[PDB]
């Protein structure tokens, strides 16, 4: 009983799709979701790097990460199999409903164990050894400690309908993967809160107000409303994926469209997920520095008590926009991996109630994701424009810092 086990990139995708689904169920927030995607990819990628002379190890490149154990030269191991095992095991550790990862895992294990028990056993064992190593490092990143950390008129207020307390005030205290510090990409400050009619703040408030009213005047056909809903990606609305998950989905689309092999797929997902996790830290750092009031609050208190945004306002401060920062970063990474002018059909939102939208490039998609927040009535211009810059600057740094691809024969 010694058939080969063919591991394909679609099995990695299976793990990431299941964790995605579980995240929705367990009600993970946008920044916490980015941490769930990153660590399991790093573990799998390290397995690949240790065994493929075209890819360099991230040990020594990511903060605190040391070399993984090498595989036993006396055993025949299928390294892709080990990489999938590592990915699933860490993914399971990072969500609450572990039984839902275990079901996916056990169903793969049963076929593998059935075809080649010895290869399966040796390969699983190595995958689990690596997951333990990577688990030790992930458990030193300050997430556990921040779980029980204690909790002008421009200050952010919780917003209706739910008036939830701000999400993840201390996300800036998580260990970044690549950044030298959480604040490395701190942006310029937002315009000073002001109700003076000639002020920069008031101009931007008036823009939010006016855009929403133009959308009203066009009616519910309007393309703006479709764009706002496509990118909304807010699990607190009173079944949706977060923005990091959506970009993980675009990374998958690109990898499948290019017929990228297991190693190239993992490379891409790892570079993207690491960048996004650092993008959330950078963006949340600024959110809780500037702690800026959301547009509906100022509009309903000072301008028009009947006005409502197209989208529900997320429960966290305004500046800079998460969508803008994370899309900026992700766009830069995918452009670097798969190229500019990469056209694609984005079907990531089809299982979540939406149609397909087509794009001519990752840059174009990011630009749409950023302006969707203006159509949505929940961000001012500065949070969007400055946020895209912040994410593109951060994603540039990540791509310039991480040396992963390194062809054996050049
Ligand atoms: Na290598």
PDB file of C-alpha atoms in Angstrom, residues 72-228:
ATOM      1  CA  UNK A  72      14.403  13.284   9.007  1.00  0.00           C
ATOM      2  CA  UNK A  73      16.636  12.197   6.098  1.00  0.00           C
ATOM      3  CA  UNK A  74      15.857   8.563   6.874  1.00  0.00           C
ATOM      4  CA  UNK A  75      12.168   8.863   6.121  1.00  0.00           C
ATOM      5  CA  UNK A  76      10.345   9.446   2.838  1.00  0.00           C
ATOM      6  CA  UNK A  77       8.216  12.535   3.429  1.00  0.00           C
ATOM      7  CA  UNK A  78       5.824  14.283   1.049  1.00  0.00           C
ATOM      8  CA  UNK A  79       6.645  17.908   1.968  1.00  0.00           C
ATOM      9  CA  UNK A  80       3.494  19.401   0.412  1.00  0.00           C
ATOM     10  CA  UNK A  81       1.456  16.989   2.510  1.00  0.00           C
ATOM     11  CA  UNK A  82       3.406  18.124   5.620  1.00  0.00           C
ATOM     12  CA  UNK A  83       2.783  21.770   4.663  1.00  0.00           C
ATOM     13  CA  UNK A  84      -1.033  21.191   4.435  1.00  0.00           C
ATOM     14  CA  UNK A  85      -0.985  19.374   7.780  1.00  0.00           C
ATOM     15  CA  UNK A  86       0.889  22.309   9.405  1.00  0.00           C
ATOM     16  CA  UNK A  87      -1.546  24.850   7.841  1.00  0.00           C
ATOM     17  CA  UNK A  88      -4.630  22.971   9.110  1.00  0.00           C
ATOM     18  CA  UNK A  89      -3.258  22.376  12.574  1.00  0.00           C
ATOM     19  CA  UNK A  90      -2.381  26.080  13.142  1.00  0.00           C
ATOM     20  CA  UNK A  91      -5.609  27.215  11.541  1.00  0.00           C
ATOM     21  CA  UNK A  92      -7.454  24.936  14.068  1.00  0.00           C
ATOM     22  CA  UNK A  93      -5.557  26.476  16.952  1.00  0.00           C
ATOM     23  CA  UNK A  94      -6.441  30.039  15.853  1.00  0.00           C
ATOM     24  CA  UNK A  95     -10.235  29.614  15.659  1.00  0.00           C
ATOM     25  CA  UNK A  96     -12.844  28.715  18.332  1.00  0.00           C
ATOM     26  CA  UNK A  97     -14.933  26.026  16.567  1.00  0.00           C
ATOM     27  CA  UNK A  98     -11.983  23.572  16.219  1.00  0.00           C
ATOM     28  CA  UNK A  99     -14.306  20.704  15.348  1.00  0.00           C
ATOM     29  CA  UNK A 100     -15.053  22.392  12.047  1.00  0.00           C
ATOM     30  CA  UNK A 101     -11.374  22.328  11.004  1.00  0.00           C
ATOM     31  CA  UNK A 102     -10.971  18.841  12.392  1.00  0.00           C
ATOM     32  CA  UNK A 103     -13.776  17.609  10.068  1.00  0.00           C
ATOM     33  CA  UNK A 104     -12.000  18.909   6.976  1.00  0.00           C
ATOM     34  CA  UNK A 105      -8.656  17.556   8.218  1.00  0.00           C
ATOM     35  CA  UNK A 106     -10.048  14.091   9.116  1.00  0.00           C
ATOM     36  CA  UNK A 107     -11.642  13.653   5.722  1.00  0.00           C
ATOM     37  CA  UNK A 108      -8.321  14.302   3.937  1.00  0.00           C
ATOM     38  CA  UNK A 109      -6.430  12.211   6.389  1.00  0.00           C
ATOM     39  CA  UNK A 110      -8.723   9.240   5.751  1.00  0.00           C
ATOM     40  CA  UNK A 111      -8.003   9.224   2.017  1.00  0.00           C
ATOM     41  CA  UNK A 112      -4.285   9.806   2.468  1.00  0.00           C
ATOM     42  CA  UNK A 113      -3.915   7.164   5.201  1.00  0.00           C
ATOM     43  CA  UNK A 114      -5.842   4.824   2.977  1.00  0.00           C
ATOM     44  CA  UNK A 115      -3.577   5.220  -0.038  1.00  0.00           C
ATOM     45  CA  UNK A 116      -0.180   5.220   1.718  1.00  0.00           C
ATOM     46  CA  UNK A 117      -0.192   4.865   5.486  1.00  0.00           C
ATOM     47  CA  UNK A 118       3.576   5.003   5.985  1.00  0.00           C
ATOM     48  CA  UNK A 119       4.049   8.093   3.784  1.00  0.00           C
ATOM     49  CA  UNK A 120       1.024   9.697   5.507  1.00  0.00           C
ATOM     50  CA  UNK A 121       2.255   8.933   8.985  1.00  0.00           C
ATOM     51  CA  UNK A 122       5.837  10.253   8.423  1.00  0.00           C
ATOM     52  CA  UNK A 123       4.599  13.310   6.555  1.00  0.00           C
ATOM     53  CA  UNK A 124       1.969  14.220   9.155  1.00  0.00           C
ATOM     54  CA  UNK A 125       4.511  13.861  11.919  1.00  0.00           C
ATOM     55  CA  UNK A 126       6.854  16.390  10.272  1.00  0.00           C
ATOM     56  CA  UNK A 127       3.973  18.822   9.587  1.00  0.00           C
ATOM     57  CA  UNK A 128       2.977  18.672  13.236  1.00  0.00           C
ATOM     58  CA  UNK A 129       6.552  19.169  14.442  1.00  0.00           C
ATOM     59  CA  UNK A 130       6.823  22.313  12.334  1.00  0.00           C
ATOM     60  CA  UNK A 131       3.401  23.529  13.570  1.00  0.00           C
ATOM     61  CA  UNK A 132       4.635  23.142  17.108  1.00  0.00           C
ATOM     62  CA  UNK A 133       7.675  25.272  16.338  1.00  0.00           C
ATOM     63  CA  UNK A 134       5.685  27.945  14.619  1.00  0.00           C
ATOM     64  CA  UNK A 135       3.070  27.738  17.436  1.00  0.00           C
ATOM     65  CA  UNK A 136       5.684  28.574  20.050  1.00  0.00           C
ATOM     66  CA  UNK A 137       6.650  31.734  18.094  1.00  0.00           C
ATOM     67  CA  UNK A 138       2.981  32.752  17.441  1.00  0.00           C
ATOM     68  CA  UNK A 139       2.291  32.446  21.149  1.00  0.00           C
ATOM     69  CA  UNK A 140       4.907  35.104  21.946  1.00  0.00           C
ATOM     70  CA  UNK A 141       3.253  37.829  19.797  1.00  0.00           C
ATOM     71  CA  UNK A 142       1.270  39.559  22.600  1.00  0.00           C
ATOM     72  CA  UNK A 143      -2.157  38.561  21.385  1.00  0.00           C
ATOM     73  CA  UNK A 144      -2.871  36.492  24.516  1.00  0.00           C
ATOM     74  CA  UNK A 145      -1.877  39.377  26.789  1.00  0.00           C
ATOM     75  CA  UNK A 146      -3.966  41.929  24.977  1.00  0.00           C
ATOM     76  CA  UNK A 147      -7.157  39.843  25.516  1.00  0.00           C
ATOM     77  CA  UNK A 148      -7.517  41.131  29.111  1.00  0.00           C
ATOM     78  CA  UNK A 149      -5.996  44.575  28.712  1.00  0.00           C
ATOM     79  CA  UNK A 150      -8.211  47.223  30.409  1.00  0.00           C
ATOM     80  CA  UNK A 151     -10.526  49.109  28.103  1.00  0.00           C
ATOM     81  CA  UNK A 152     -12.403  66.988  22.073  1.00  0.00           C
ATOM     82  CA  UNK A 153     -15.886  66.888  20.569  1.00  0.00           C
ATOM     83  CA  UNK A 154     -14.005  65.359  17.541  1.00  0.00           C
ATOM     84  CA  UNK A 155     -13.460  62.176  19.537  1.00  0.00           C
ATOM     85  CA  UNK A 156     -14.854  58.926  18.200  1.00  0.00           C
ATOM     86  CA  UNK A 157     -18.234  57.863  19.613  1.00  0.00           C
ATOM     87  CA  UNK A 158     -19.878  54.516  19.309  1.00  0.00           C
ATOM     88  CA  UNK A 159     -22.537  54.568  16.603  1.00  0.00           C
ATOM     89  CA  UNK A 160     -26.055  53.236  16.118  1.00  0.00           C
ATOM     90  CA  UNK A 161     -27.752  50.841  15.904  1.00  0.00           C
ATOM     91  CA  UNK A 162     -25.545  48.719  18.247  1.00  0.00           C
ATOM     92  CA  UNK A 163     -23.262  51.371  19.918  1.00  0.00           C
ATOM     93  CA  UNK A 164     -20.555  48.781  20.208  1.00  0.00           C
ATOM     94  CA  UNK A 165     -17.295  49.625  22.004  1.00  0.00           C
ATOM     95  CA  UNK A 166     -14.325  50.178  19.699  1.00  0.00           C
ATOM     96  CA  UNK A 167     -12.800  46.981  18.257  1.00  0.00           C
ATOM     97  CA  UNK A 168      -9.254  46.059  19.201  1.00  0.00           C
ATOM     98  CA  UNK A 169      -7.940  49.311  20.768  1.00  0.00           C
ATOM     99  CA  UNK A 170      -4.648  47.586  21.468  1.00  0.00           C
ATOM    100  CA  UNK A 171      -4.015  45.905  18.131  1.00  0.00           C
ATOM    101  CA  UNK A 172      -0.963  48.177  17.962  1.00  0.00           C
ATOM    102  CA  UNK A 173       0.551  46.098  20.763  1.00  0.00           C
ATOM    103  CA  UNK A 174       0.682  42.870  18.680  1.00  0.00           C
ATOM    104  CA  UNK A 175       4.157  41.933  17.409  1.00  0.00           C
ATOM    105  CA  UNK A 176       4.421  42.915  13.789  1.00  0.00           C
ATOM    106  CA  UNK A 177       5.887  40.377  11.315  1.00  0.00           C
ATOM    107  CA  UNK A 178       8.069  42.745   9.228  1.00  0.00           C
ATOM    108  CA  UNK A 179       7.614  46.294  10.593  1.00  0.00           C
ATOM    109  CA  UNK A 180      10.280  47.721  12.832  1.00  0.00           C
ATOM    110  CA  UNK A 181       7.441  49.064  14.997  1.00  0.00           C
ATOM    111  CA  UNK A 182       3.704  49.415  14.840  1.00  0.00           C
ATOM    112  CA  UNK A 183       4.029  53.123  14.074  1.00  0.00           C
ATOM    113  CA  UNK A 184       6.514  52.812  11.221  1.00  0.00           C
ATOM    114  CA  UNK A 185       3.973  53.958   8.676  1.00  0.00           C
ATOM    115  CA  UNK A 186       2.090  56.514  10.782  1.00  0.00           C
ATOM    116  CA  UNK A 187       0.413  58.904   8.285  1.00  0.00           C
ATOM    117  CA  UNK A 188      -0.052  62.622   8.407  1.00  0.00           C
ATOM    118  CA  UNK A 189      -2.747  63.633  10.922  1.00  0.00           C
ATOM    119  CA  UNK A 190      -6.328  63.998   9.751  1.00  0.00           C
ATOM    120  CA  UNK A 191      -7.821  67.439   9.323  1.00  0.00           C
ATOM    121  CA  UNK A 192      -8.776  69.075  12.587  1.00  0.00           C
ATOM    122  CA  UNK A 193     -12.389  68.523  13.559  1.00  0.00           C
ATOM    123  CA  UNK A 194     -14.220  71.756  12.857  1.00  0.00           C
ATOM    124  CA  UNK A 195     -17.727  72.963  12.062  1.00  0.00           C
ATOM    125  CA  UNK A 196     -16.437  76.119  10.484  1.00  0.00           C
ATOM    126  CA  UNK A 197     -17.663  76.289   6.900  1.00  0.00           C
ATOM    127  CA  UNK A 198     -14.277  77.176   5.418  1.00  0.00           C
ATOM    128  CA  UNK A 199     -12.434  74.392   7.297  1.00  0.00           C
ATOM    129  CA  UNK A 200     -10.857  71.287   5.644  1.00  0.00           C
ATOM    130  CA  UNK A 201     -12.862  69.001   8.009  1.00  0.00           C
ATOM    131  CA  UNK A 202     -16.159  70.615   7.151  1.00  0.00           C
ATOM    132  CA  UNK A 203     -15.430  70.342   3.472  1.00  0.00           C
ATOM    133  CA  UNK A 204     -14.828  66.661   3.837  1.00  0.00           C
ATOM    134  CA  UNK A 205     -17.966  66.155   6.005  1.00  0.00           C
ATOM    135  CA  UNK A 206     -19.991  67.977   3.422  1.00  0.00           C
ATOM    136  CA  UNK A 207     -18.640  65.717   0.696  1.00  0.00           C
ATOM    137  CA  UNK A 208     -19.813  62.574   2.618  1.00  0.00           C
ATOM    138  CA  UNK A 209     -23.204  64.170   3.141  1.00  0.00           C
ATOM    139  CA  UNK A 210     -23.568  65.277  -0.491  1.00  0.00           C
ATOM    140  CA  UNK A 211     -22.400  62.001  -2.058  1.00  0.00           C
ATOM    141  CA  UNK A 212     -24.998  60.054  -0.063  1.00  0.00           C
ATOM    142  CA  UNK A 213     -27.709  62.498  -1.161  1.00  0.00           C
ATOM    143  CA  UNK A 214     -26.681  62.120  -4.861  1.00  0.00           C
ATOM    144  CA  UNK A 215     -26.935  58.390  -4.427  1.00  0.00           C
ATOM    145  CA  UNK A 216     -30.453  58.823  -2.996  1.00  0.00           C
ATOM    146  CA  UNK A 217     -31.365  61.009  -6.011  1.00  0.00           C
ATOM    147  CA  UNK A 218     -30.195  58.211  -8.434  1.00  0.00           C
ATOM    148  CA  UNK A 219     -32.180  55.428  -6.713  1.00  0.00           C
ATOM    149  CA  UNK A 220     -31.296  51.896  -5.730  1.00  0.00           C
ATOM    150  CA  UNK A 221     -30.093  50.861  -9.206  1.00  0.00           C
ATOM    151  CA  UNK A 222     -26.960  52.979  -8.773  1.00  0.00           C
ATOM    152  CA  UNK A 223     -23.562  51.560  -9.377  1.00  0.00           C
ATOM    153  CA  UNK A 224     -22.316  53.320  -6.204  1.00  0.00           C
ATOM    154  CA  UNK A 225     -24.554  51.355  -4.023  1.00  0.00           C
ATOM    155  CA  UNK A 226     -23.402  48.082  -5.699  1.00  0.00           C
ATOM    156  CA  UNK A 227     -19.745  49.080  -5.132  1.00  0.00           C
ATOM    157  CA  UNK A 228     -20.381  49.991  -1.477  1.00  0.00           C
TER     158      UNK A 228
END
